[PDB]
Amino acid sequence: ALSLTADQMVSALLDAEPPILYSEYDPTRPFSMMGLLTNLADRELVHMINWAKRVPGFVDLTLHDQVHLLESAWLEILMIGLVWRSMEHPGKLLFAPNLLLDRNQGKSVEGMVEIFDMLLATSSRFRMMNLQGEEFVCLKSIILLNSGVYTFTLKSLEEKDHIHRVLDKITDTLIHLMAKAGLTLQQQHQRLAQLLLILSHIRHMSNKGMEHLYSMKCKNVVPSYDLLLEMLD
Amino acid sequence: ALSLTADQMVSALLDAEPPILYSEYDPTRPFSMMGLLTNLADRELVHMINWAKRVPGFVDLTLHDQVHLLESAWLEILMIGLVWRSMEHPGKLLFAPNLLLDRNQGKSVEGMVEIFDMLLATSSRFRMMNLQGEEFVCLKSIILLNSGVYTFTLKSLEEKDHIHRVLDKITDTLIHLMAKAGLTLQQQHQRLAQLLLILSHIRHMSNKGMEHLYSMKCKNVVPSYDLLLEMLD
Ligand SMILES: Cc1c(O)ccc2c1CCN(CC(C)C)[C@@H]2c1ccc(/C=C/C(=O)O)cc1
Numbered sequence: 001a002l003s004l005t006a007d008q009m010v011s012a013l014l015d016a017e018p019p020i021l022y023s024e025y026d027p028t029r030p031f032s033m034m035g036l037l038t039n040l041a042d043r044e045l046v047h048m049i050n051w052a053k054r055v056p057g058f059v060d061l062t063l064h065d066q067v068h069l070l071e072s073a074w075l076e077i078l079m080i081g082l083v084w085r086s087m088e089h090p091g092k093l094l095f096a097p098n099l100l101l102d103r104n105q106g107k108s109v110e111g112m113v114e115i116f117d118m119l120l121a122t123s124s125r126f127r128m129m130n131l132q133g134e135e136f137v138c139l140k141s142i143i144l145l146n147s148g149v150y151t152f153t154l155k156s157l158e159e160k161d162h163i164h165r166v167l168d169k170i171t172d173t174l175i176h177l178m179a180k181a182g183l184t185l186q187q188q189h190q191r192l193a194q195l196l197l198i199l200s201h202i203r204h205m206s207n208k209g210m211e212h213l214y215s216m217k218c219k220n221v222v223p224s225y226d227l228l229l230e231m232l233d
Numbered sequence: 234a235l236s237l238t239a240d241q242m243v244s245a246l247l248d249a250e251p252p253i254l255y256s257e258y259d260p261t262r263p264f265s266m267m268g269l270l271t272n273l274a275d276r277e278l279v280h281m282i283n284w285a286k287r288v289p290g291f292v293d294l295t296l297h298d299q300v301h302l303l304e305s306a307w308l309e310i311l312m313i314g315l316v317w318r319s320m321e322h323p324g325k326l327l328f329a330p331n332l333l334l335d336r337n338q339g340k341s342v343e344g345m346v347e348i349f350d351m352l353l354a355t356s357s358r359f360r361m362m363n364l365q366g367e368e369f370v371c372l373k374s375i376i377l378l379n380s381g382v383y384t385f386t387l388k389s390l391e392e393k394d395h396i397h398r399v400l401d402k403i404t405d406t407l408i409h410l411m412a413k414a415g416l417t418l419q420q421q422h423q424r425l426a427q428l429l430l431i432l433s434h435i436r437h438m439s440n441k442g443m444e445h446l447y448s449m450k451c452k453n454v455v456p457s458y459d460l461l462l463e464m465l466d
């Protein structure tokens with residue numbers, strides 16, 4: 001994992017990519033949005049577990065630390081995937097290929113249009129930077145490893161060190177991609193910073209969404225430690 | 234502002250630095266924590282306004298955009314200052330020089346120990362990286378310009394462009410500092426990434442704190458648009 005070259009890191013991330021899923025509704029029947037969005041997120045989560053297990057370095061950690069990282073990052077990971085999928089659809093969010101929604105459609109749930117807006121703005125930022133697919137898979141892996149690393153014994157000290165070494169290797173990889181693309185050293189650092197600073201906004205979006213989900217006060221909303229543990233163990 | 238050299242950028246940021254404030258309690262009387270923390274935050278905010286006006290590029294923006302940026306970033310800015318001040322005090326948060334609190338002291342307010350923990354962990358990360366004062370002022374300015382830039386007309390398009398150009402100049406500056414310190418190009422990119430990724434965790438902490446403050450449901454807690462506008466106008 002730490003002996004991978006930049007090209008090998010990229011290949012491994014592209015190969016791990018999950019599929020794009022469809023919403024489950026009868027397309028021959030007349031057009032609940034939260035129902036549809038919950039079911040889609042439930043099914044994406046299963047595939048996210050399989051993806052995470054294929055990110056280099058991730059299965060080297062303890063199962064408890066794998067669960068902690070996924071618990072912290074899962075909604076950010078869903079959100080970056082949505083933003084990426086929606087990039088060439090100005091003004092719309094491509095939740096699935098059969099579920100392409102505008103901001104007015106989010107107005108149907110109290111608190112949701114604000115989240116829809118923030119997601120559309122991130123998509124439009126990605127569009128303005130001309131984000132590449134190889135840069136997106138790197139960013140997504142960085143979210144997985146970084147989002148829970150500050151909230152965790154000799155074992156833990158070793159786990160945090162390894163997570164930081166893996167993160168350094170993905171930073172190396174990003175820079176390599178930008179060098180292969182022909183950017184100057186100045187441009188390279190500038191773009192790296194631009195990309196990482198968007199991750200702060202993705203955190204914010206997830207925190208805002210988590211607050212909505214927690215406020216629903218429902219045992220079938222938000223995956224528990226135990227469900228994540230069962231799926232990962 | 235965009236014509237500043239890296240050295241000039243650093244000098245200007247160091248010069249803008251606000252003072253460290255004291256808690257207001259009678260030190261001769263027996264030892265409310267939330268009272269003391271609110272009063273301290275109220276007074277720090279005034280000084281933060283003056284600081285922000287001295288960050289290069291910031292007064293070039295519209296007053297409405299200055300207010301939006303401060304509204305989004307103020308608690309993150311207080312939190313990064315606390316973490317920096319607390320760096321050489323393992324296990325304790327130096328809220329002020331006369332108010333140095335451990336995690337057990339945070340247990341006195343329902344929900345606060347969790348926030349205290351996250352802040353102690355960030356301080357300990359800064360300690361492990363050996364963060365330098367010149368890097369800290371850069372990071373703090375980056376928070377100010379970045380945290381509200383994705384949530385904002387021809388004027389706005391021009392304002393977001395300028396904010397991104399200012400941010401690129403601070404990225405250049407960071408890298409220059411790390412080059413002056415003797416780091417390799419590889420180390421330079423790696424450390425830049427490490428530093429920016431901590432900003433995501435600072436966002437998360439602020440979101441968690443904002444939720445506590447909003448849940449107090451009090452007109453004298455959280456600065457309004459109008460108060461920020463009055464202080465900045
Ligand atoms: C990015 C994304 C998806 O790809 C799929 C669903 C949702 C989002 C972001 C917006 N979000 C809605 C936001 C208000 C958070 C959708 C969502 C809806 C329900 C659940 C519930 C999951 C569960 O309860 O286990 C999670 C996310």
Ligand SMILES: Cc1c(O)ccc2c1CCN(CC(C)C)[C@@H]2c1ccc(/C=C/C(=O)O)cc1
Binds near residue numbers: 348
């Ligand atoms: C970093 C920091 C300070 O330097 C000063 C106070 C506080 C923090 C972080 C933790 N925080 C407590 C957290 C629960 C947010 C403190 C705080 C307390 C009250 C207020 C209220 C301000 C207002 O109501 O205008 C703001 C921050």
